[PDB]
Amino acid sequence: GQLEDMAQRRKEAADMLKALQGASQIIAEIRETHLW
Amino acid sequence: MEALIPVINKLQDVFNTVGADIIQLPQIVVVGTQSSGKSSVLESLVGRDLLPRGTGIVTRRPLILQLVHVSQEDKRKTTGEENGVEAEEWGKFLHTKNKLYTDFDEIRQEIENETERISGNNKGVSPEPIHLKIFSPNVVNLTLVDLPGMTKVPVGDQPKDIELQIRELILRFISNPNSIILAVTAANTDMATSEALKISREVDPDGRRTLAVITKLDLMDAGTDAMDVLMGRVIPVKLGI
Amino acid sequence: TLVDLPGMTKVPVGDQPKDIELQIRELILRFISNPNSIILAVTAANTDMATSEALKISREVDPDGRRTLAVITKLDLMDAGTDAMDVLMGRVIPVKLGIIGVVNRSQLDINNKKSVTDSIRDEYAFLQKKYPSLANRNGTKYLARTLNR
Amino acid sequence: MEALIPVINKLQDVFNTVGADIIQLPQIVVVGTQSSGKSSVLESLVGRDLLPRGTGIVTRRPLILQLVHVSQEAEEWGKF
Amino acid sequence: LHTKNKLYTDFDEIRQEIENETERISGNNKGVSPEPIHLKIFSPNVVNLTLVDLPGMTKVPVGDQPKDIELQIRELILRFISNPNSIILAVTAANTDMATSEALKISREVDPDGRRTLAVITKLDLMDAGTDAMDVLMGRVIPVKLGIIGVVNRSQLDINNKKSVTDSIRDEYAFLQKKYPSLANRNGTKYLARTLNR
Amino acid sequence: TLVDLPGMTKVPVGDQPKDIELQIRELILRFISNPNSIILAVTAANTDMATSEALKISREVDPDGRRTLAVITKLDLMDAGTDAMDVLMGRVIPVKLGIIGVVNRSQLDINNKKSVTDSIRDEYAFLQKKYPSLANRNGTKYLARTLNR
Amino acid sequence: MEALIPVINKLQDVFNTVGADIIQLPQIVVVGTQSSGKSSVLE
Amino acid sequence: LLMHHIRDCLPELKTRINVLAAQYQSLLNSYKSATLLQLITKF
C-alpha cells in the first residue's frame, strides 16, 4: 500500500547533449544556399 | 546570410534562459593589440560611433555585436521574438526588459553605466556577457564579439589581475572549436605576431582559423614597399589577408 | 580536516628516526584499514600512472574503487605526447567513479586574489583545449561532488 | 565541500544532542609523490588557501588541519 | 682563433672555412656542435659588441635540412637564454608586440621577471600609418626595463638583389629622414650600438 | 660491463607474482653485495630526493655509500624552486670521487628517440640553467674520468 | 670601460676552444626565426 | 569565411558530439516497480 554527484553529472550530460543536438538540428535546417 | 544571425540569437537566448555557459555558440572573436583599431572596425561595421576609443575605454565587459540586415522579407523574423517596430534603426539588449534604444551615444552611456554597476569598484569580469542587437539596413547580417585589449594606460586604475581576467575571458570565448578568432592588427603588425596568433597556437598545435585584418591604410606614405602587407608571403594565413 | 601524507620517508637523512619509514607505513595502513579515511589518489600527469605509488597503495585495500578516487595533476605542465585520454576513459585505470583532473594554481594567481570561479573556468578551458571530448569529466565542481559522495 | 557546510554542522549538533559518541570527522588522507599539487587541489575544493603550495615541495608532514566551529562540542587564521 | 689566425680579406673564404668546419666536426649531419666558432670582425662602423647567431630555420620549407633541426635549435636557445650574464636579444619581425614573440615567449619561461630580456625590431621598411611602435615603446602591452629598439633592414626584393650593406645603410637613412620626422635619430648602427650598451 | 637489472618493486599489483619482490631483492643483493660491483643509483627528479627507492636499498646494505654513486636523471621535470647543489658538493655525503648527475632526455625527446649528442646538449643546457659551476662536474666527461679512475 | 668587452670576448673564445662552455660572462645572444630580419641586421 | 568554417567543422562537430554522447552513456552505465516488488517479496 505504501511502498548527488551522479545526479549532477547525469543532468549536466543530458543538458549538454540536448543543447548540442538542438544546435546541430538548427544548423542543418539552414538553407543549403546559405551555407557556402 | 539571413539565417545564421537568427540562429546565433536563438542559441544565445536559450543559453541565457538555461543559465549555462560551459561552451559558447559559434561566432567571431575580435582580439588584437591595444588601440589596434578594433573599436574603429566595429564602428565602421555599425556605420556610426558607439564605442570608446583612445584613452577613454571603460566598457571592459565582453560586448557581442550582432548586426542584423533590415529588409521587407526579414521583418517577420526580426519581429518574431519581439513586437513590431517601425523604426528603421533600433537596438536592444537581451539582459534588459526588451528595452529599445536608438541613439548611439545613449546606447554607449547605458552600456558604460551597466558595466560600472555590475563590475562595481573592481573592474574584473562577470558571467553575464553584454548582448547587443542592431537592426539597420546599412549593416549586413554579421556577428562580432568585442573584448578589452592591453589597456595598461592609467584610465582610472585597474585590478592587478585585470590581465589574467582578460586572458581567461578570451580563452573561454575561443574555447568553442566553431568560433573563429579575428586577429585585428595595424599595418605594421601584418602577420608576424599578435595576441590572437599566440592564443590560437596555444589552444591548438596549428589552429584551423587565421584571419588578419589591416586598418589605417590611408594615411601611409608613398614610396614604401607593401608587398608583404597584401601578398603575405612571410606567414600566409588560411583565411587570407 | 585536511591532511597531506608524504609518500613515506624512504631515505632517512638527518635527525629523523631510523624507523620513520616503518612508523609512516603503519600509520598509513591504520588510516586506510577503516573507511573513515578518504583515499584520494593524486599523481602527476607527466609521470606514468602505473609507476605512481599512490594508486598502488590505494588499490591494496580498495581495489574495486568504490571508496577510492584517482586524481591527475600537473595538467598545465604536462609534456606533449604523454596524453592522458586513455586514463580518463578508464581503459587503463578502471575506476567506479572516474578519473578527475585538476589544474594546479601557482603562487602568482593566489597573490593576485584570483577567485575560485576564475580557476574553474581556466580548468574547463584547459580541458577543452587538451581534451576535445572530456571537458565535463574533470571539472572541479565534479571533484567536489565526488568527494561529498 | 561547498554544499557540505550546513550538513556537517547539523550532523554534529544532532550527535551532540542525542548523547552518542562524537565520532571525529573523516580526515582527508592523500598519499603520493611530493610536489604533486595535492594541497592546491584540496584548497581549490575548499575554496580557500590554507596549506603550502606553489613550485617546490608542497607537503612535509601530515598536518591535522582541524577546523573547529563554536557550539559543535577572510576570518581564517592559525593558532597553537 | 682555432685556425692559423690567417686574415680572410674576402668573406667567401670565411664562408667556405665555416662550411668545412661544420662538415668535419659535425660529419655529414649539419647539426649544431658544442664548439662554437670564434669569429673576429674589425669594422669602423661598429663598436665593442658581442653577438651570437643561432641556427635559423626557413618558415617555408626550402632545400634540405636535418630532421632534428627544430629540437637542436630549441635546446641551443634554451641553453643560451638561461644564462643570466647574457642578455636575450629577440628578433621580432615588424613592430609587433614583442610579448607574443616566440623567442620572448620561450625566454619568459626561464626569465619570469623579464629583467634581462631585450626585443629588437626588424624589417621597418614596411612601416606605415596606424598603430605605430609608440605603444610598444611606452610598455602599454607589458612593461619592459630594457625597452624596444627599432632597426631598419633590407626588403625581400633588396635581399634577392644581393644589395650591398652600404646601400642598405643609405636606404635606412633615407627612410628615417623621410618617414620619421623626429624619431630618426633613435636608429642608426652607431646609435644602435650605443643603445645596446646603455 | 654494463648491466641494467630490474629495480626494487613495491607490493605486486596486477598479475605479478606475490613473492616477486623478494626474488628481485635477493637477485639484486646477489650481485651488488660484492665490493667490486658498482651501484650507480639513478633517481628521477619528478619525485622527492628522499623518496628514492634506489637510495633506500643502497642504505640497506651500503650505509656509507663507499661504492655508491648518486645520479639524478630526467631533471627537466624537476620541481622549480628546489636545488641540490649542496648534495652534489658532498656537504652531506662527502665522497672523493664526487656525485655526478646525468640528465636523461625529456619526455618528447625520449618519444622521438633522440641521439646521445642531443642528450648531452640538453644535459649541459639544464646544468647551466640550474648550476653552471657544477655543470662541468655533472657532465659526462667527469663520469668518464671517474670510470677511468 | 671599453677594454672589458674585448677581454671577456677573448676569455669566452679561449674557453670555447678548450671545449668547455660552462663559463658564463656578460654578452648578447640573438634569438629569432629565419626570414624575420635577423640575418639582414646581422649582416 | 564564417560560413566556410562552419561547413568545414560540421563533420568535426558531429564527431565530437557523438564522442561526448558515447562517453556520457559509458560513464552513466558504469556508475523499477518490478524490482521494488521483487525486493519487497524477498524481504
C76: its cell numbers: 598545465
B158: its cell numbers: 585597474
Separation in Å, CA of H30 to nearest CA in chain A: 11
| Chain B residue numbers touching H9 (CB-CB < 8 A) | 177-178, 208
Query: How far is it, in rounded angstroms, from Cα E135 to Cα F78?
Result: 38
Query: How far is it, in rounded angstroms, from Cα F70 to Cα F57?
Result: 13
Element (H, E) at D68: none
Strands (E), chain E: 86-93, 117-122, 148-150
The secondary structure of B36-49 as a DSSP string is SSHHHHHHHHHTS-
Q: Is the CB of B177 less than 8 angstroms away from the CB of C118?
A: no
Geometric angle at alpha carbon C83, from C79 and C86, rounded to 5°: 160
When scoring H9, H28, H40 by the number of chain A Cβ atoms within 10 A, the one with the most, hence best to mutate, is H28
Alpha helices in chain D (DSSP H): 5-18, 38-46
> Taking CA atoms, what residue in A is nearest to H41?
A3
> If you search the block for the grid coordinates 573561454, which residue do you land on?
B172
Sheet holding B180-186, edge to edge: B100-101, B90-92, B130-136, B63-69, B142-146, B28-32, B180-186, B211-215
E189: its cell numbers: 648602427
Query: How far is it, in rounded angstroms, from Cα B34 to Cα B184?
Result: 10
What burial letters (b/e) apply to E84-121, b meaning 16+ CB within 10 Å? eebbbbbbbbbbbbbbbbbbbbbbbeebeebebbbbbb
Chain CA centroid to CA F127, Å = 15
Nearest-10 Cα torsion for F5, F8, F13, F14 = 10
Query: How far is it, in rounded angstroms, from Cα E198 to Cα F10?
Result: 59
Specify the amino acid at residue E21: E
Query: What number of other Cβ atoms are within 10 A of residue E38's Cβ?
Result: 15
Sheet holding G27-31, edge to edge: E148-150, E117-122, E86-93, G27-31
Q: Which residues are registered as beta bridge partners of E128? A: none
User: Does the annotation list G19 as a binding residue?
Assistant: no
Separation in Å, CA of E94 to nearest CA in chain G: 8
Q: Neighbours of E (≥3 Cβ pairs closer than 8 A)?
A: B, F, G
* CA-to-CA separations, E17 to E23, E33, E66, F136, G32, in angstroms, rounded: 10, 15, 21, 30, 24
What burial letters (b/e) apply to B102-140, b meaning 16+ CB within 10 Å? eebeebbebbeebbeeebeeebbbbeebbbbbbbbeebe
CB pairs under 8 A between E and F: 35
E54: its cell numbers: 643561432
Query: How far is it, in rounded angstroms, from Cα A19 to Cα C116?
Result: 26
User: Does the annotation list G34 as a binding residue?
Assistant: yes
Query: How far is it, in rounded angstroms, from Cα E67 to Cα F101?
Result: 29
Query: How far is it, in rounded angstroms, from Cα F42 to Cα E135?
Result: 51
Nearest-10 Cα torsion for B10, B15, B17, B22 = 180
| Chain A residue numbers touching B18 (CB-CB < 8 A) | 15, 19
Cβ atoms F137, F98 nearer than 8 A: yes
Cβ atoms C7, D32 nearer than 8 A: yes
> Taking CA atoms, what residue in F is nearest to E68?
F114
**Which residues of E participate in the annotated binding site?**
122-128, 153-156
Q: Is the CB of H5 less than 8 angstroms away from the CB of B208?
A: yes
| Chain A residue numbers touching B7 (CB-CB < 8 A) | 26-27, 30
Cβ atoms G22, F136 nearer than 8 A: yes
Tell me whether strands E86-93 and D28-31 are parallel, antiparallel or unpaired. unpaired
Query: What number of other Cβ atoms are within 10 A of residue C38's Cβ?
Result: 17
When scoring A11, A12, A17, A30 by the number of chain B Cβ atoms within 10 A, the one with the most, hence best to mutate, is A30
Cβ atoms C116, D47 nearer than 8 A: yes
H40 CB contacts (<8 Å, ≥6 apart)? A3
* CA-to-CA separations, F9 to C50, F19, F111, in angstroms, rounded: 12, 11, 24
Helix/strand/coil for B134: strand
Query: How far is it, in rounded angstroms, from Cα E85 to Cα C58?
Result: 48
Tell me whether strands C68-73 and C99-101 are parallel, antiparallel or unpaired. parallel
User: Does the annotation list C52 as a binding residue?
Assistant: no
Q: Is the CB of G24 less than 8 angstroms away from the CB of F128?
A: yes
Do the chains D and H touch each other, judged by at least 3 C-beta pairs below 8 angstroms? no
Q: Is the CB of G31 less than 8 angstroms away from the CB of E2?
A: no
